[PDB]
Design a protein around this ligand. Structure first.
Ligand SMILES: OC[C@H]1O[C@H](O[C@H]2[C@H](O)[C@@H](O)[C@@H](O[C@H]3[C@H](O)[C@@H](O)[C@@H](O[C@H]4[C@H](O)[C@@H](O)[C@@H](O[C@H]5[C@H](O)[C@@H](O)[C@@H](O)O[C@@H]5CO)O[C@@H]4CO)O[C@@H]3CO)O[C@@H]2CO)[C@H](O)[C@@H](O)[C@@H]1O
Ligand SMILES: OC[C@H]1O[C@H](O[C@H]2[C@H](O)[C@@H](O)[C@@H](O[C@H]3[C@H](O)[C@@H](O)[C@@H](O[C@H]4[C@H](O)[C@@H](O)[C@@H](O[C@H]5[C@H](O)[C@@H](O)[C@@H](O)O[C@@H]5CO)O[C@@H]4CO)O[C@@H]3CO)O[C@@H]2CO)[C@H](O)[C@@H](O)[C@@H]1O
Ligand SMILES: OC[C@H]1O[C@H](O[C@H]2[C@H](O)[C@@H](O)[C@@H](O[C@H]3[C@H](O)[C@@H](O)[C@@H](O[C@H]4[C@H](O)[C@@H](O)[C@@H](O[C@H]5[C@H](O)[C@@H](O)[C@@H](O)O[C@@H]5CO)O[C@@H]4CO)O[C@@H]3CO)O[C@@H]2CO)[C@H](O)[C@@H](O)[C@@H]1O
Ligand SMILES: [Mg+2]
Lengths: 421, 421, 421
């Protein structure tokens, strides 16, 4: 059996008191991870090539994820069964090197490790013909699925609370990669078309976005013994909320009291990303991100986000180093024009199983410091029924309340382990 | 470690709209599976022979099952811990070749693959001396356990709602197999005696069936490079409801509102089955079932069921074929004499890791069509308290209601993977 | 992948009726296990040495525990994710042979197998530098964590129900082992200091113990081809309730109706233990325990406990024996001076994968008999709100009630499997 996975687990403390806390800018879709992760998360994969004849084989892959809080030993939990697929390589003679897979699978996902942000991920139940050689590049085709909690009505109601039927959304993905636009550089182009797929006779809210498009262009350039990727994405409507390739065309959401509400996503998103890792010499490695994300919605509740951070690693020994991370977020409310921001500065001493910034296991002993100043937050007081600004951006002191994290500081510290295998 | 299991996962669509739907005749205990399974189901076994000395060994087996809906990636769930037993082979000198096992285990279960119907399965916590050589055949002995949700009273009440104590049932199984009644044919005979096993001082409802018997005779005939099994079973009372070897002698059931009710099972069941798989030549494989099940209860709510289906596979290549399934169900209400029926016709193009109809992995791309016409359904409207016909067969339009699936059509299609390893 | 674990699963019956029951003296923190365990419990570990260079390696270990009731096959459950750590051996040059680990881990726990009682176990999320060679012995250092359900107030309230915030507790452990105080004998000394660690601005109840100490001294003496351990421990305050190395400094507990209550643990505990296993000749093995535990609390609700039992095994064959266990408990209420006691006498015929009393797998067929007489129990009638003696020791007939198990008998029997691998 093949055994693979990922896991991070550790123990931390808050400078001001109690267990370790993690810091994330309100409105930001990520946080700088080093010395800023507060769960024990783990995926345990058990796969196995079950049949091979010459060039042909059938591979079987699975994945069961756990995520506990790490405040005790016995921590019962509901594991997510995330993957169970079969990939058949070289089964179509006239489409050599290509795979046909079906099942629940993590499909070609793209992410930025240091902020743990996945920008292109349509994983889920699915099927596809992957890696067809089109000569100048490799062409792939997949259809995956997701489904929103409610959003549909068995009959046409004018009352939003009548749209509580789960609504399946379908994504149809087409990618064209490994095109060498230049020397050292490759270009991948992708098109995603998602749409809410209603049961016969069901209806979505009026004005529900219903569908959308995600367009991706990733350029990878080999550099300094590392790489640099430059991404540019553009989403439309129903693809703006999840913003990674998955569709939410119903536009209905529910509060903790099962009350439906209208998170209308018509609009568009523009994402421009640049990240990579470069080795500069023998004693330094460093990863970096820079991103600007603009979710512009028709309802005016979008956000304009900017992040920048670097993680320079200096190797003392082939298995010991000093890692340092510095991140900065700044999110502006579309509805209110206010701005939230934060800068995190972490310093760690680690031991890796390798001389890379990419080598895992890694055992870290760190200290983190964050200082923020948020001038707006979301109004989640009340009920989707009691409240009418429920789920909206609102100023920090709106109606004499407290919204956002405030303007403060904090420092934490602890030991952690991280490993993909 | 040994790694074994089973898994099926896929993505589907409904001709009329939304995700794939599955079709099963109301009153039928199964449905024709090809292109008609709507969950991601998976069992992951991890066993290991932990000790061996010459002829003697101790094998340790486990099984953890998951079953998600496959409408998203992250799907939290409560896995069933189904097996954790130890089998000791050849530990009793004067009973050579025999095993002594104890633990929770799937014990010698018999099923009909294409309708995924298990007709002889007493699996559960248990213990037994398996495979004793009696000369003309192999004799096995096991005792397993199950327990119904409520059914017992701490004191004698006249009120059914007082019977909410879980009631353990015990099965005592004896099988005599591998007897060669003829050439190419073997005969297995089995006797199952189950009984509700009450705590000291507890009482079961009046008229509760309390116990029962299941009698099995299976004849396997080697044929056409395949086999054909002919089964005949007869159950009595408390063994009629589950009808596979497990006992439910309390006769109390609960509605979703915790209301007790009386699902009295005194009566008997007669099952006559014939299924198998035969290869006819080099280009065809085909499995088939034919069954007639008659659950006749004292309360008149039993059913008389008939199924027939065939799954012919024609091999284009050693690893590619066209599978087709055709199934027909027809269940008649004992209480009302009405009839529900359906015919499913599926057509699929698959790729297997083998030239057999039994070879897995298998990746299918299918289209299914079902057309039904049900004239009765069960009355599950209301409450075990509000309703008095609660849980009874009732005509399709009873009291101006709608019971049963109606008289309709539908077609679906999608891609799926199936694999046992 | 490395595959390890533990598992026990079986089927039992109660002499007087229904499934097997287990017997434990009210007030005792354990019971004699042989033929007296009523769950299917299982830990499945999957680890793997992920990197090795010469003397250096990184080992990755995990653990997922299940515990079902074993009254049916399909038994859904919430598995506990208990371990996910990385151990780096020999990574610190000038501290050779030593390990640095971080993650959630079962750390050097001590237990008495036959009563399944862990007397020194601080496992949980943690980190440490283990096995430093101090010359005369090996010195280890670890910090682990636990957290109580509530116990903290966001503001100073006088009302106990205001202390519902989870309160993290930290343990700081230091051990000094493998010191050879004599020939055949080793000495381990340990010091544990635990303390509730409050969020900035939170408050614990008044008089909450807040912290404490656990002091351990274990002497292992090689004897009769076995060992004998003699333990002496002394806890203080917040370490008295769990009494194994974990801290509970808040002193607030909750009833099943979320009502807070005061389980004040100021006081101390004195534990004097002696257990071991010795082989006496070729045909006998025998394990034994003897313990006296005195939890003396300021609130007068502590207990004074005494246990003694032996498990002599006589080998008929290298793989078959007759095991017998005899245990006696006697707990006296601190609050009421009354006494509860019981004696269990079990007799089993087993088959092991070895000629040891320590060899597993093991398949047992047993019969157990217990006879008790309890003169006090805890008052758990009512509510933390309705009741005021809620959670207190109370006489068997207090206020005309029934508290304690009474004065009775019972016998059970069944087959079971046990295995660590
Ligand atoms: O070798 C073929 C392989 O190559 C490439 O994979 C590499 C990635 O491109 C590269 O970025 C890197 O990926 C790492 C990732 O950086 C690292 O962080 C880790 O990812 C973890 C997250 O850290 C963890 O938080 C968790 O995230 C969850 C999240 O909590 C959950 O809410 C939801 O969003 O799902 C996430 C994922 O389940 O899990 C992820 C891992 O699942 O590990 C990544 C790799 O496993 O390194 C990769 C090689 O090691 C290609 O991208 C890939 O397609 C090729 O197959
Ligand atoms: O080699 C020794 C072995 O031989 C024989 O096993 C073979 C079977 O006789 C033969 O019929 C076939 O069995 C397959 C079965 O046909 C196939 O469908 C699959 O079974 C799955 C179901 O498909 C799946 O739905 C699921 O069913 C659950 C069900 O959802 C749940 O509600 C409840 O009813 O439990 C069921 C089972 O857990 O799971 C089953 C599998 O557990 O796989 C079967 C085999 O694993 O092929 C067998 C050999 O591959 C003997 O019968 C056997 O005793 C001998 O040990
Ligand atoms: O080889 C290096 C190893 O050596 C030593 O380990 C040995 C132990 O010292 C020795 O006593 C023995 O330990 C056994 C134990 O006797 C046996 O009972 C079993 O323990 C099970 C329990 O039986 C089982 O009930 C369960 O207990 C749970 C409990 O239900 C739960 O509520 C909570 O309290 O956690 C408990 C544990 O999770 O699980 C335990 C096992 O986890 O197995 C033990 C060993 O696995 O034999 C050991 C060697 O086989 C050192 O002590 C150890 O540090 C060294 O690493
Ligand atoms: Mg659960």
């Amino acid at each position: 059996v093949d055994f693979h996975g990922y896991a991070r687990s550790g123990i931390g403390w808050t400078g001001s008191g109690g267990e370790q806390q993690c810091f994330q800018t309100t409105g930001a879709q990520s946080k700088y991870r080093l010395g800023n992760e507060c769960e024990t998360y783990a995926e345990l994969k058990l796969g196995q090539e079950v049949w091979k004849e010459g060039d042909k084989s059938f591979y079987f892959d699975t994945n069961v994820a756990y995520s506990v809080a790490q405040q005790n030993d016995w921590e019962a939990t509901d594991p997510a069964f995330r993957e169970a697929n079969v990939q058949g390589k070289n089964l179509i003679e006239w489409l050599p090197g290509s795979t046909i897979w079906a099942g629940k699978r993590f499909y070609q996902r793209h992410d930025v490790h240091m902020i743990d942000f996945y920008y292109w991920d349509i994983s889920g139940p699915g099927a596809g013909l992957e890696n067809i050689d089109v000569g100048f590049g490799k062409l792939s085709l997949a259809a995956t699925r997701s489904s929103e909690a409610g959003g549909s009505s068995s009959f046409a109601s004018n009352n939003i609370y009548d749209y509580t039927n789960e609504t399946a959304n379908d994504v149809f993905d087409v990618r064209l990669a490994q095109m060498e636009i230049n020397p050292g550089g490759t270009l991948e182009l992708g098109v995603d078309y998602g749409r809410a797929n209603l049961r016969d006779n069901y209806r979505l809210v009026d004005g529900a976005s219903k569908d959308g498009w995600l367009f991706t262009a990733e350029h990878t350039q080999s550099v300094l013994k590392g790489f640099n990727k430059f991404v540019v994405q553009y989403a439309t409507d129903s693809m703006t909320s999840q913003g990674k390739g998955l569709s939410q065309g119903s536009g209905v959401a529910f509060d903790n009291e099962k009350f439906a509400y209208n998170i209308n996503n018509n609009g568009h998103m523009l994402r421009i990303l640049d990240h990579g890792a470069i080795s500069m010499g023998d004693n330094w490695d460093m990863m970096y991100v820079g991103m600007y994300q603009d979710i512009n919605w028709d309802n005016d509740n979008g956000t304009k986000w900017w992040t920048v951070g670097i993680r320079p690693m200096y190797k003392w020994t082939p298995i010991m180093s000093t890692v340092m991370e510095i991140g900065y977020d700044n999110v502006e409310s579309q509805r209110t024009g206010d701005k939230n921001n934060q800068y995190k500065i972490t310093l760690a001493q680690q031991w890796q199983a390798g001389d890379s910034i990419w080598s895992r296991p890694a055992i870290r002993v760190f200290a983190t410091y964050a200082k923020w100043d948020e001038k707006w937050g979301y109004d989640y007081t009340g009920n989707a029924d009691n409240n009418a600004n429920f789920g909206k951006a609102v100023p920090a002191d709106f109606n004499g309340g407290s919204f956002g994290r405030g303007d403060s500081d904090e420092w934490t510290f602890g030991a952690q382990m991280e490993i993909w295998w």
